[PDB]
Design a protein around this nucleic acid. Structure first.
Ligand SMILES: [Mg+2]
Ligand SMILES: [Mg+2]
Lengths: 77, 77
DNA sequence: GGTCCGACGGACC
DNA sequence: GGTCCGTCGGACC
C-alpha cells in the first residue's frame, strides 16, 4: 500500500525539481547526486526508494528511447 | 580471454575520453549517452559491454564515495 | 594538482 | 513549446 519511506520519497521529489531547475533530465544518477548533496542519503538507498516510490505511484517513471527519467505526479508535463 | 565485443570496448573508451573532455565524471549514464550519440548503440547493450569490459580488464571501474566511474587503462590517474 | 559540479544559452524535436 | 544537451569557469578535496 506504501512500501517507500515517505520522507525519502519527499527528498526524491525535491531532487527531481532541483535537477529540472538545473535544466537536466531527472535520471537515476542525477537524482542520487541531488539527494546525496541535500540530505546525505547513500546512493544504494536512494535507488531502492526510487524503485519503491514508482511502485507506490508517488513517482512516475517515464520510458524515454534514450535514458529513462522520473517525474513528480504534481508536475507530469 | 575476452568476453566483451572488442569494437564496443573501443567505442566505450572513446566515450570515456569524450565525457572527461566535457569535464564530467564518466559514470554509466554519461557513457551510455556518449556511445549512443556517437555510434547509435542502445543503452542496454552499452551497459552489458561496460560490465564485460570491466571483467576483461580493458576498462577500469573505480569505487567512489558517490557515483562510481570508469577509466581507460591508458589514462588511469 | 586534479576532478567534475553547477549554471545557463540555445539546440533539438 | 518544452526538455535537456553541451560548454566551461571555477569550486571542491
Ligand atoms: Mg591549484
Ligand atoms: Mg519555440
Amino acid at each position: 500500500v506504501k512500501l517507500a519511506n515517505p520522507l525519502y520519497t519527499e527528498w526524491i521529489l525535491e531532487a527531481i525539481k532541483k535537477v529540472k531547475k538545473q535544466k537536466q533530465r531527472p535520471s537515476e544518477e542525477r537524482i542520487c547526486n541531488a539527494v546525496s548533496s541535500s540530505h546525505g542519503l547513500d546512493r544504494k538507498t536512494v535507488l531502492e526508494q526510487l524503485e519503491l516510490s514508482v511502485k507506490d505511484g508517488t513517482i512516475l517513471k517515464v520510458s524515454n528511447k534514450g535514458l529513462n527519467s522520473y517525474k513528480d505526479p504534481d508536475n507530469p508535463g
